[PDB]
Design an enzyme around this catalytic site. Structure first.
Site, mmCIF file in Angstrom:
data_model
loop_
_atom_site.group_PDB
_atom_site.id
_atom_site.type_symbol
_atom_site.label_atom_id
_atom_site.label_comp_id
_atom_site.label_asym_id
_atom_site.label_seq_id
_atom_site.Cartn_x
_atom_site.Cartn_y
_atom_site.Cartn_z
ATOM 1 N N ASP A 253 0.867 -1.163 0.000
ATOM 2 C CA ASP A 253 0.000 0.000 0.000
ATOM 3 C C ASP A 253 0.923 1.238 0.000
ATOM 4 O O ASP A 253 2.123 1.117 0.268
ATOM 5 C CB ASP A 253 -0.949 -0.010 1.202
HETATM 6 O O1 LIG Z 1 -5.156 1.954 -4.350
HETATM 7 C C1 LIG Z 1 -5.720 2.263 -3.051
HETATM 8 C C2 LIG Z 1 -4.622 1.959 -2.087
HETATM 9 O O2 LIG Z 1 -3.460 2.262 -2.894
HETATM 10 C C3 LIG Z 1 -3.140 3.625 -2.729
HETATM 11 O O3 LIG Z 1 -3.800 4.510 -3.670
HETATM 12 C C4 LIG Z 1 -3.480 3.743 -1.236
HETATM 13 O O4 LIG Z 1 -2.319 3.329 -0.552
HETATM 14 C C5 LIG Z 1 -4.562 2.795 -0.805
HETATM 15 O O5 LIG Z 1 -5.651 3.582 -0.326
#
Ligand SMILES: OC[C@H]1O[C@@H](O)[C@H](O)[C@H]1O
Ligand SMILES: CC(=O)O[C@@]12CO[C@@H]1C[C@H](O)[C@@]1(C)C(=O)[C@H](O)C3=C(C)[C@@H](OC(=O)[C@H](O)[C@@H](NC(=O)c4ccccc4)c4ccccc4)C[C@@](O)([C@@H](OC(=O)c4ccccc4)[C@H]21)C3(C)C
Ligand SMILES: CC(=O)O[C@@]12CO[C@@H]1C[C@H](O)[C@@]1(C)C(=O)[C@H](O)C3=C(C)[C@@H](OC(=O)[C@H](O)[C@@H](NC(=O)c4ccccc4)c4ccccc4)C[C@@](O)([C@@H](OC(=O)c4ccccc4)[C@H]21)C3(C)C
Ligand SMILES: *[C@@H]1O[C@H](CO)[C@@H](O[C@@H]2O[C@H](CO)[C@@H](O)[C@H](O)[C@H]2NC(C)=O)[C@H](O)[C@H]1NC(C)=O
Ligand SMILES: *[C@@H]1O[C@H](CO)[C@@H](O[C@@H]2O[C@H](CO)[C@@H](O)[C@H](O)[C@H]2NC(C)=O)[C@H](O)[C@H]1NC(C)=O
Ligand SMILES: *[C@@H]1O[C@H](CO)[C@@H](O[C@@H]2O[C@H](CO)[C@@H](O)[C@H](O)[C@H]2NC(C)=O)[C@H](O)[C@H]1NC(C)=O
Ligand SMILES: *[C@@H]1O[C@H](CO)[C@@H](O[C@@H]2O[C@H](CO)[C@@H](O)[C@H](O)[C@H]2NC(C)=O)[C@H](O)[C@H]1NC(C)=O
Ligand SMILES: *[C@@H]1O[C@H](CO)[C@@H](O[C@@H]2O[C@H](CO)[C@@H](O)[C@H](O)[C@H]2NC(C)=O)[C@H](O)[C@H]1NC(C)=O
Ligand SMILES: *[C@@H]1O[C@H](CO)[C@@H](O[C@@H]2O[C@H](CO)[C@@H](O)[C@H](O)[C@H]2NC(C)=O)[C@H](O)[C@H]1NC(C)=O
Ligand SMILES: CC(=O)N[C@H]1[C@H](O[C@@H]2[C@H](O)[C@@H](O)O[C@H](CO)[C@H]2O)O[C@H](CO)[C@@H](O)[C@@H]1O
Ligand SMILES: CC(=O)N[C@H]1[C@H](O[C@@H]2[C@H](O)[C@@H](O)O[C@H](CO)[C@H]2O)O[C@H](CO)[C@@H](O)[C@@H]1O
Ligand SMILES: CC(=O)N[C@@H]1[C@@H](O)[C@H](O)[C@@H](CO)O[C@H]1O
Ligand SMILES: CC(=O)N[C@@H]1[C@@H](O)[C@H](O)[C@@H](CO)O[C@H]1O
Ligand SMILES: CC(=O)N[C@@H]1[C@@H](O)[C@H](O)[C@@H](CO)O[C@H]1O
Ligand SMILES: CC(=O)N[C@@H]1[C@@H](O)[C@H](O)[C@@H](CO)O[C@H]1O
Ligand SMILES: *[C@@H]1O[C@H](CO)[C@@H](O)[C@H](O)[C@H]1NC(C)=O
Ligand SMILES: *[C@@H]1O[C@H](CO)[C@@H](O)[C@H](O)[C@H]1NC(C)=O
Ligand SMILES: *[C@@H]1O[C@H](CO)[C@@H](O)[C@H](O)[C@H]1NC(C)=O
Ligand SMILES: *[C@@H]1O[C@H](CO)[C@@H](O)[C@H](O)[C@H]1NC(C)=O
Ligand SMILES: OC[C@H]1O[C@@H](O)[C@H](O)[C@H]1O
Lengths: 756, 756
Positions: A253
């Site tokens: 993430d």
């Molecule tokens: O794709 C959603 C996830 O990836 C990024 O955009 C963020 O870390 C999370 O909310």
């Protein structure tokens, strides 16, 4: 204790793996560190190219309702909304339509779906709406279909978020921006999860995602047993990569990675976003990784396996032979990225109709005292800003639907806030659609859509308008967003106030709730002036025209609740969100497998509306339960296979073999055609076992008055198994199994026993 | 000097007169004073019954867009809007459709149309929009058709307001409420009008109303030569009742009566509203009148003539044989009248389509630099609250569309404020209609409809939205209302601000103005970023769907301006509205017949857009002017006849005989089908005569590319006459007459001479 197992390509990816391995064996160290950390581009994440070997940058793009931050696309309804349909066909088609648009916008890897994290431990979870059901089995199935849908278009899936990511409060992504670092303020919430609970509750829907062939998996922000999910060896190397036999990549993430070496050794494959977003969210690999390999603290071979897992997807989906077109939209945003956008329209004919059908299939009737379906009312009142447009524009709240003012009249809540949202080409407002229908009936219709507490005259207007109306529609909403939990269940905006006025001046009030989750309607739900209540969830762009046909009787409402609607937040699992300033915040999952309805059933608490509850315009009588022991079948279909140990294993055998099928009959017993969602629950015997566990649903379509249909429930081995923490395997316990079937988790008129 | 002439029934009412006289000869004095002063009821005015003779109460109901204050009816576009169509067929049908609804709601007498008061002396007149053209001839014709339309349904007309009622400021209706009396503060504005100006300018459209068979006439609030209009012997007994030979009733405007005896002797027939509205607006007759007759200061016979004129209409329209149904709506309002409303729907199929057609026929294209008609834009921006609903509801501003807050976002301006307005069963908003069309083209569309100065974020939203748009629609409005004049020509609400933002962030801005009159667009009209400008006036309920087909090219715009659009208010007739605290305020009509374009032409001033200007999507070439001296005809059609003296009178002869007809040819000379409004102007020779005077229009429909049509202009005797103040008659002056024909008051490529 747990070494990193090498990719082999498993079932369907065997040939892609081989091409992947070929390519990676040619790569230098400088190139391995490139493909495996994020660089600057127009998409949410971008892997660096390997330009000498002809491998381009991969666009990694948000999100679980479709490509976020782009024009020329459709706003699909949310995961929550499709789950409420309980219709496997729409779960698939939704995802395939998303995939088409993802592909056509030039996305290689979709940051989707949300497949079990958050699953549902709190009803206040700010992004809970991005998933599907608060239930392992149902989520499992929706997850399988969502993955399959996206992969069957050209897009690789990054199923999220692994694992026990059950609160936004203290999620604490790594960030170091303007000299304050999140490492200096607070560690991410530690989800402390016993081995049974992890296997029976949180891992279930990820197994399904893995079986369906997720190309990748995002590791979560939370820590698990005070270890970051993205550097948790037990999590990623053992549970995911060994036991679930996962053959693809773990992607961090954005700010999910906290260190360089532990993450390189405990199961992470892709550092995201790397150099994107100014490097503010940690930039642990890249040249730092090259330096770690060349000085011999990180195995070069380990890192080749990372590259192998990233390319397997690239080759399996045929992104070399059939590349996606260029991504054309700046989805990051200035000043973080100054760069111009082009334009592409990918809206295909059919998509708008699918989005509508999902809405019409999901909207859930919670109460109906006789006011619905509407015949031909002549004087119609409408209350709530939710009834009409965002006063600033459908997309004014920006790239993630979250930058409008706290008090802004945002209009119909069509998706939630955060990375999971998407732009909209328009909004078919509930008022537009109600008016169209009023016009057809030569009727009149008037809406008060301002803030009823703060705008001069609104209160008097509502007093002057409601008395003479045949019907009063009140439209309510509850915005929630990634990065925060809801503080309580109370309605957004002026909602409480609307409802006090409405029942003060009208005795035929029909309530429609657009929301990311459960809300507090306690003050009015038993008011007889509230004649009907419906939750439409997050319907995407076709809000108004999906709703009105249901209201007017063109189709009977058929959705049922994908989670439990308790009378108070105190009736849920305790410590659903932990709030501390403590440097190392802790969330001890002492409830165990007992979340949502399992909590409610085990402790004798009565919700207002139970898991899987929904009214129709007609009734359904259940009859003739049959357990067919002879209706069993081998596990053929799966794209990929896990290595989940189980007791009854021999050479050729599987945890997902169907060991029996169960049948029942429904009769349409009322005075109108309707569709019915039949549910099947098993009580697995054992110590500290739930009263009931959903292990099947089946939706009968448009059953005419007095007709009957059989409803069918194949049961897998896994569906009757427990996890043995001592033996470390899935086993089918000896004992008596109750099998129940009916309209909801608490309306189960058929039951029988099954013993193995 | 001028005695009150007795009714005789004139042309068409002869038999009604006889029944009227029969009934009145039976009436006692107590009954004469009853029928002839207003009592309490649900309608704007109500005459008392004569219950012994079986005569019921008459419902007298507002207003000139249709029955005001009722549910179950349609909101027709305003007089201003229909005038802008320049289409006699729509002028008729509008009025007949209004009449149907009036009738079906139970109205005996319609307080309509507005037929020459206000005519157009100020462009700031707050209720100017209730009439039609700022021109005696065109108003005359629209007045004839409007009356005829209403009478051909079952409703008696009360044509208003007689006469020289040209400002709302100091109109000063008689009122005595809570101990302050308007008699104590200020006398009504005195319109001081010479005899030529009265005959050639203000009386013209009333003659037409009288010819068409108005059953009654409302006398105005203003004084004329420091005498109240409603007790002006020269006004009502001579000019109206002798010279125009008016055979029906004079009705007071509500507070139009200031005294008992002078009004009884100088031409008033009906005291309104009498006991209604708490008697606050003067209650001069009733029992006071009974007492005046019985003590012999008011002739009993005089008062019988009043009753005769009230009943003639009752009998002529067949309200005895075919009574209207009961009036069912409280249109006065609590606490002034506490009384419950019933419900009736009178919306007939066809009406909505007529209202739309009027809109599509009126909307006037002032500028088009190539942006229109739209092909298939893909990204569409919309600005202005005018684009969408009133945030409180279409009817929130109450019984007269005037009780919403000063700053309230009222939405699309569909009618003006005051007694002339009406409720609406809905509003088809310009945004709804633009969206429908965007959807058809697989396009996107987004509106910012908040207050751009006062709502958080609106400015940024507009900055973020406009750059990427193919087209930006900006919707502007200007509310005005009965009882006040506009202070200047400046746009309502945030309009100026919208337009500064729009041209700052878009180079394809299309402007649409909903308004009661001329507005100030000087700062932006020559900006090349403003690619197109259109005024849609007050379209009534079908605003959006009448407009969008014109924008998209389904029909070419065909409306032209019913008044002059000057660059500044200083370019108009001076002292258009007089503001004093002076106890006896004076407005000396020194301009004479020179109002609107007559002022502009006489003094060499160039408007931005001239009287009768309108763009099409194609062009029209004029050719082959013909003056047919032999194409003359007797005056047959008129319902009633005047007694206007004229020099050429013999036994059988008339001022409205057609003495010649003129023809011309138009060719569609461009690349698209369009309709053209051809105009004919005569210059009558004399001392101090206008350059040009409109004496004909004719609208060619949907002329294909390269085709031709003849346009025809019958000319009456009156149309070439002057009023002789010495001889006191209409004469045809000797001299050379210029006759010009073309697209506008200033685009007249054909001219010839005619000498009598
Ligand atoms: O794709 C959603 C996830 O990836 C990024 O955009 C963020 O870390 C999370 O909310
Ligand atoms: C913190 C975070 O999640 O950042 C990211 C950027 O990649 C992350 C993934 C995430 O999904 C993404 C893209 C989102 O879509 C989120 O919905 C999203 C957020 C949740 C939001 O992040 C927050 O609200 C943080 O709580 C907030 N955090 C802080 O202010 C903070 C600062 C120092 C220490 C501890 C905390 C923040 C605001 C603005 C920029 C950075 C951080 C930023 C962000 O702009 C978006 O952030 C940026 O675009 C951005 C971040 C850093 C630098 C430049 C731009 C956000 C949006 C779109 C609004
Ligand atoms: C002044 C006036 O025109 O009154 C009437 C009532 O019959 C008149 C005919 C008129 O067409 C009618 C029906 C309207 O439709 C007008 O659009 C109309 C008005 C122009 C308005 O009148 C005004 O705004 C006056 O300028 C205003 N005048 C004063 O306040 C005033 C008081 C003392 C001395 C001098 C002036 C007023 C406000 C409210 C009640 C009475 C007078 C009242 C009125 O409520 C409406 O007024 C009432 O309903 C009403 C009047 C008196 C007592 C009770 C009710 C109005 C509306 C509907 C808003
Ligand atoms: C590491 O990745 C970067 C970023 O993708 C590569 O640089 C880009 O290469 C493409 C072709 O693949 C060029 O068109 C771009 O101009 C490059 N972008 C930038 C910002 O430089 C880079 O080549 C990769 N490194 C290696 C060793 O392959
Ligand atoms: C987190 O902590 C729990 C609690 O200690 C771990 O549970 C143990 O797992 C082992 C096998 O890995 C078993 O033999 C123990 O009996 C389990 N104990 C309980 C109480 O369930 C769990 O595996 C840890 N998870 C992670 C991801 O680190
Ligand atoms: C309209 O949406 C905006 C976001 O686009 C909402 O504002 C946020 O609300 C949350 C509470 O859930 C706050 O914690 C945030 O700080 C707010 N964001 C900003 C930028 O101020 C708003 O609540 C929504 N409107 C309504 C009426 O609910
Ligand atoms: C004067 O007019 C009044 C009001 O219209 C008459 O009284 C009404 O008469 C009707 C029948 O025409 C009754 O149904 C109503 O009850 C009466 N209304 C009120 C308020 O009294 C009255 O009769 C008329 N006077 C004369 C002498 O005819
Ligand atoms: C108002 O005043 C004007 C100006 O005096 C009147 O005009 C006169 O009318 C008589 C016939 O009525 C003529 O013989 C005069 O020559 C006229 N004078 C002018 C200057 O036009 C006008 O008639 C009066 N109107 C009313 C309604 O009282
Ligand atoms: C919306 O309409 C209201 C009336 O219903 C307007 O308010 C009036 O405006 C005039 C100026 O023309 C004032 O003299 C009045 O006092 C106002 N009425 C009240 C009751 O306050 C308002 O201006 C309109 N909104 C906009 C944006 O123009
Ligand atoms: C089947 C099961 O869940 N068993 C227990 C388990 O506790 C473990 C287990 O008994 C064994 O491996 O030894 C360790 C160490 O003493 C013990 O913790 O998990 C739960 C705890 O959440 C027990 O209550 C179960 O009975
Ligand atoms: C035809 C015309 O309009 N004549 C004049 C008129 O003035 C009148 C008229 O001359 C005659 O009846 O006598 C009186 C009294 O002396 C006189 O006022 O009207 C205008 C005034 O607005 C004159 O300028 C005309 O010339
Ligand atoms: C960025 C970097 O060079 N990291 C270095 C690694 O290369 C070596 C090691 C000493 O053996 O020390 C690490 O910090
Ligand atoms: C098999 C495994 O992966 N983990 C352990 C293992 O240490 C032990 O030997 C086994 C007995 O079969 O029990 C589990 O607790
Ligand atoms: C209301 C009323 O009675 N008015 C009277 C009239 O009847 C007589 C006259 C004296 O002859 O005086 C008037 O004021
Ligand atoms: C006829 C009329 O109504 N009014 C007068 C009249 O006093 C005069 O005798 C006449 C000459 O014909 O001129 C008008 O000024
Ligand atoms: C983008 O441009 C802005 C100025 O408008 C500047 O502040 C910023 O440095 C730029 N962003 C990057 C990442 O260079
Ligand atoms: C229901 O509405 C009516 C108005 O129709 C009101 O008088 C009554 O108090 C309301 N009842 C409740 C329980 O709110
Ligand atoms: C109408 O009722 C109100 C009380 O709600 C009262 O003030 C008023 O006197 C009544 N009106 C009339 C004309 O009697
Ligand atoms: C026209 O719009 C552009 C933006 O498209 C802006 O830069 C320019 O200044 C505007 N021109 C005028 C005359 O307002
Ligand atoms: O009908 C409109 C007219 O009649 C009354 O309502 C008022 O006096 C004028 O505005």
């Amino acid at each position: 204790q747990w070494p990193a197992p090498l990719a082999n390509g498993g079932k369907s990816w065997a040939s892609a793996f081989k091409k992947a391995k070929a390519t990676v064996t040619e790569m230098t160290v400088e190139e391995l560190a490139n493909i495996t950390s994020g660089v600057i581009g127009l998409c949410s994440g971008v892997t660096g190219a390997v330009t000498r070997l002809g491998i381009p940058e991969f666009c990694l793009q948000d999100g679980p309702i479709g490509p976020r931050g782009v024009h020329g696309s459709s706003q699909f309804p949310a995961g929550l909304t499709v789950a409420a349909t309980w219709d496997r066909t729409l779960m698939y088609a939704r995802a395939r339509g998303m995939g088409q648009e993802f592909h056509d916008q030039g996305v290689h890897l979709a940051l989707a779906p949300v497949t079990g994290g958050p699953l549902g431990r709190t009803p206040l979870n700010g992004r809970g709406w991005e998933g599907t059901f608060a239930d392992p089995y149902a989520c499992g199935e929706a997850s399988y279909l969502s993955v399959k849908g996206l992969t069957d278009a050209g897009v690789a899936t990054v199923s999220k978020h692994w694992i026990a990511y059950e609160q936004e409060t203290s999620r604490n992504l790594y960030i170091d921006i303007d000299g304050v670092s999140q490492a200096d303020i607070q560690l991410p919430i530690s989800s402390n999860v016993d081995d049974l609970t992890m296997h029976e509750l949180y891992m279930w829907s990820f197994a399904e995602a893995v079986r369906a062939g997720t190309n990748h998996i995002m590791c979560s922000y939370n820590r698990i047993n005070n270890t970051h999910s993205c550097s948790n060896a037990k999590g990623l190397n053992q549970l995911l990569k060994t036991e679930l036999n996962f053959q693809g990549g773990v992607v961090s993430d954005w700010g999910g990675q906290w260190d360089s070496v532990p993450a390189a050794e405990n199961g992470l494959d892709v550092a995201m976003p790397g150099k994107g977003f100014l490097g503010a969210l940690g930039d642990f690999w890249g040249a730092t990784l090259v330096e770690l390999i060349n000085n011999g603290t990180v195995s070069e071979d380990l890192v080749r396996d990372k590259a192998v897992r990233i390319l397997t997807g690239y080759y399996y989906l045929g992104q070399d032979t059939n590349p996606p077109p260029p991504f054309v939209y700046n989805t990051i945003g200035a000043p973080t990225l100054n760069a111009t956008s082009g334009y592409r329209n990918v809206r295909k004919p059919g998509t708008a109709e699918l989005i509508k059908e999902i809405g019409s299939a999901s909207v859930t009737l919670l109460k109906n005292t006789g006011s619905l379906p509407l015949k031909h009312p002549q004087r119609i009142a409408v209350l709530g800003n939710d009834a009409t447009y965002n006063v600033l524009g459908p997309n004014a709240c920006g790239l993630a639907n979250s930058a409008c003012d706290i008090d802004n009249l945002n209009g119909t809540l069509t998706t939630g806030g955060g990375s999971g949202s998407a732009l909209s080409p328009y909004t078919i407002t509930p008022l537009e659609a109600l008016q169209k229908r009023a016009i057809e009936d030569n009727a009149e219709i008037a809406a008060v859509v301002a803030n009823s507490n703060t705008t001069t005259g609104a209160e008097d207007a509502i007093a002057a308008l409601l008395p003479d109306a045949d019907v009063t529609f009140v439209f309510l909403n509850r915005y929630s967003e990634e990065g925060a939990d809801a503080p309580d269940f109370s309605l957004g905006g002026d909602g409480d106030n609307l409802m006090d006025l409405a029942v003060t001046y009208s005795s035929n009030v029909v309530v429609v709730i657009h929301t990311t989750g459960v809300v507090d309607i306690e003050k009015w739900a038993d008011n007889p002036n509230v004649t009907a209540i419906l939750v439409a969830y997050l319907p995407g762009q076709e809000a108004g025209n999906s709703l009105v046909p249901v209201l007017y009787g063109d189709v009977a409402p058929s959705g049922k609740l994908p989670w439990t609607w308790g009378k108070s937040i105190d009736d849920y699992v305790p410590n659903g969100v932990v709030y501390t300033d403590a440097y190392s915040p802790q969330s001890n999952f002492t409830e165990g497998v007992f979340i949502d309805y399992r909590w409610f059933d085990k402790m004798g608490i009565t919700p207002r509306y139970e898991f899987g509850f929904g009214l129709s315009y007609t009734t359904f009588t259940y009859s003739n339960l049959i357990v067919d022991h002879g209706r069993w079948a081998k596990d053929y279909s799966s794209v990929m296979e896990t290595a989940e140990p189980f007791a009854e294993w021999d050479g050729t055998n599987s945890l997902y073999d169907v060991i029996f099928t169960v049948f029942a009959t429904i009769t349409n017993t009322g005075n109108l055609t309707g569709s019915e969602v039949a549910q099947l629950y098993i009580s697995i015997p054992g110590d500290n076992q739930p009263v009931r566990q959903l292990r099947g649903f089946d939706k009968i379509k448009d059953l005419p008055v007095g007709d009957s249909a059989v409803v069918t429930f194949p049961i897998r081995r896994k569906d009757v198994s427990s996890w043995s923490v001592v033996d470390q395997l899935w086993y089918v316990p000896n004992g008596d199994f109750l099998i129940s079937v009916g309209g909801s988790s608490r309306d189960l008129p058929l039951n029988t026993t099954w013993t193995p």
